[PDB]
Amino acid sequence: KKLTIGLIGNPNSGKTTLFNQLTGSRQRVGNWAGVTVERKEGQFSTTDHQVTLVDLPGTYSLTSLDEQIACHYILSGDADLLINVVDASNLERNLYLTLQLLELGIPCIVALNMLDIAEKQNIRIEIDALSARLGCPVIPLVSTRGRGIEALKLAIDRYKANENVELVHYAQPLLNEADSLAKVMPSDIPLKQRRWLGLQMLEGDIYSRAYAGEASQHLDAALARLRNEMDDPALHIADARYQCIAAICDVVS
């Protein structure tokens, strides 16, 4: 059976290296539609699947051209699953991107990279505790004898919808305002993603408005409403995300 998988992580996080390991010489260099950014695709197989792997440009956040490409692809829904390459030696910084994928609700597998760099600086990562808090599998990419890859291939064959765990705990009125923005958005987009798009707009993101159809004319009204209910809506959003990531890292690292 054929799956298409998007490969996503921070720049400088061993993403290209995983890409080459997975695909060997079975890769095509193309170009992202309408821009001159290079788009790599590659092929590998698993026990049950033939996999088309799409390397997305490194990015720290879904919220320059590169960043925008990753996000447009993530939101296009073309991919069945995403492989999220995470630097174990910079967990907290790297999970900011992971959180957005999970909030978007896209099937995810976290390939925990740079174990050897982590080990070297006395950082150990509690794999199952991370996995429980994310609601998606976490696969240590041991480089020794291709073990990591084999285990990743196993995870791919066993992939499923993420566990619907609570992630960031937003103040209710932000959720409320996001719900309101969400119901006036193009319905071709899942409710979960519509809610996420609303949340980004409230925090002040401009690229998100592009997918949200009508919503952007309701935003100033939404924001004007919110500022009666709290002192800094966008900062409360920043604060709840950080709260969530730091509570994870405290247990996990």
Q: Where are the domains of the chain?
A: 1-167, 168-253
Domain 1-167 listed as CATH 3.40.50.2300: no
Q: Is 140 annotated as a binding residue?
A: no
Q: Is 1 annotated as a binding residue?
A: no
Q: Is 198 annotated as a binding residue?
A: no
Q: Is 205 annotated as a binding residue?
A: no
Q: Quote the CA–CA distance of 75 and 147 in Å, as a whole number.
A: 31
Q: Is 11 annotated as a binding residue?
A: yes
**Cβ count near 223 (within 10 Å):** 15
Q: Is 34 annotated as a binding residue?
A: yes
Contact (CB, 8 A) for 162 and 136 = yes
Method: X-ray
Q: Is 53 annotated as a binding residue?
A: no
Q: Is 35 annotated as a binding residue?
A: yes
Helix, coil or strand: residue 18:
helix
Residues ≥6 apart with Cβ < 8 Å to 80: 3, 4, 5, 107
The CA-CA-CA angle for residues 96, 196, 130, to 5°, reads 35
Amino acid at 8: I
Residues ≥6 apart with Cβ < 8 Å to 115: 88, 140, 141, 142, 143
Q: Is 12 annotated as a binding residue?
A: yes
- Record the resolution, in angstroms: 2.2
CATH (residue range 168-253): 1.10.287.1770
Residues ≥6 apart with Cβ < 8 Å to 31: 37, 38, 39
Contact (CB, 8 A) for 57 and 19 = no
Residues ≥6 apart with Cβ < 8 Å to 132: 165
Q: Is 98 annotated as a binding residue?
A: no
How far is Cα of residue 117 from the mean position of the Cα atoms in its chain? Answer: 23
Residues ≥6 apart with Cβ < 8 Å to 141: 18, 111, 112, 113, 115, 148, 149, 151, 152
How far is Cα of residue 248 from the mean position of the Cα atoms in its chain? Answer: 16
Q: Quote the CA–CA distance of 96 and 248 in Å, as a whole number.
A: 11
